[PDB]
Design a protein around this ligand. Sequence first.
Ligand SMILES: [Mg+2]
Ligand SMILES: [Mg+2]
Ligand SMILES: [Mg+2]
Ligand SMILES: [Mg+2]
Ligand SMILES: [Mg+2]
Ligand SMILES: [Mg+2]
Lengths: 274, 274
Amino acid sequence: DPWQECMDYAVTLAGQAGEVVREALKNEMNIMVKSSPADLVTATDQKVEKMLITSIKEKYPSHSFIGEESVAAGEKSILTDNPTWIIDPIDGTTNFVHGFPFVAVSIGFVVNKKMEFGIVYSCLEDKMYTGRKGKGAFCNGQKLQVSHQEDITKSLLVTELGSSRTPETVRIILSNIERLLCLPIHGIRGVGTAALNMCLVAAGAADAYYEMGIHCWDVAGAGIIVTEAGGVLLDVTGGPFDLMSRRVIASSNKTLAERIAKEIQIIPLQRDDE
Amino acid sequence: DPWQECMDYAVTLAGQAGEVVREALKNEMNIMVKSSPADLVTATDQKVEKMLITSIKEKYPSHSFIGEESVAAGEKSILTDNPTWIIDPIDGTTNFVHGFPFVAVSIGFVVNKKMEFGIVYSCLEDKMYTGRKGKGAFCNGQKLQVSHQEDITKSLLVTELGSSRTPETVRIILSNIERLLCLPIHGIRGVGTAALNMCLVAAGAADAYYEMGIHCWDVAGAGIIVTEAGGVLLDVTGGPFDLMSRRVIASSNKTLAERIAKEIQIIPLQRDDE
Ligand SMILES: [Mg+2]
Ligand SMILES: [Mg+2]
Ligand SMILES: [Mg+2]
Ligand SMILES: [Mg+2]
Ligand SMILES: [Mg+2]
Ligand SMILES: [Mg+2]
């Protein structure tokens, strides 16, 4: 089972990356700015990504890579049918900078443009989330299952305010939150990382997650965990989920997903493939 | 040391209450609503409260009690100088109903209308947060310390959307978030409970917490944990913290607290002592 060997190797690697992250948390940081004042990167993000990609590439030199900080350093963000590793070295950089205890290493493996396996390591909780097509979803060995609430007025939803600080954009995000909150729903949550918000849905701790402004690396590892736990992915348009589209609804079921799509106003964004 | 004997006993009872909450997560729930369609209560909330008060009262029958569900049943919430136990049997009922893993038992002990000790047990995490005036703040025996960021534009703030579903109320809460978000700040977080949001600030995982709409039982146990970890409490008016006012800023430092107070709009609220 070649993909299982890939996965086993990558789980070990994610563990090693999380040790690096924990040690760095206790040292002084170099906090740099990317696309907005709220879009942060540290030297640890960059170091961990280099560690991960150079290791995996050395072992699997014919595979392809899409990494967040690699793309920031000029690599192209193209998804082909070739086995592709989609890496977020630190999902929740802002959390890392503050010691907010939801910081993930995320690794997605994609073949024929379909998610095959995903690894999301919650570094500060020591929780290893895994999933693989046809194999189940787990947290530290415990099988994961989504909840089953088809009534949005009894749902607990998850989302984030995003790194944008452009007033028009922030206004639509908050207007989407206002619309949903007043349907009414039970509440909105978030822990400040897309991967771990999705893992909370996978585990049955909330009913659905949505966000616009994410990238393929934020969601590729957690997407298969959600679906192997029994959930569904959709685009915010109602159509099929598209990994390169910057948009996601990750839901325990289709009824909830389709309803959320109906209430959300779409923001404009640069696709990861343009 | 009389109050230490009170505290040691109450930590044992908090542990017992947390085991009751964890066993209830398993079984069917009776979900009732209180002050709004999103203000939930279960039989477990009511059970735990009665367990706590009957037990503490037998040991300390001259002391006073203020409990969330007792007040909901018609009891008064009068704070006198008499040693007073202020109890939130389950802080985060919505989280409890959904399995969102931040659910707390909160006990505050107040003497001469001053916080003396506080106990906040994170049930699903097995994290016992404690604090006593002149003794320090701890999580499972490890001393807590707030972080030190005096620049709000580099801050991570914590808050919640509230249980109100009244449009005019939700509009101000979201406007306050918009104002803060665009200062700009690094982000807003929350885990869906006042007491655990405050314990995250105590532990240095976020820079400050604010909310309007809370009650004395939401904050009495965590308040002393925040101040013994080196933080400060303030009213949103900039004045001293008032436990019965339905308003709180719990901050690592005074500079951030005062800036938050300057930026947000107050919502009118029925006091706990009116
Ligand atoms: Mg980033
Ligand atoms: Mg990242
Ligand atoms: Mg990310
Ligand atoms: Mg309540
Ligand atoms: Mg409560
Ligand atoms: Mg409460």
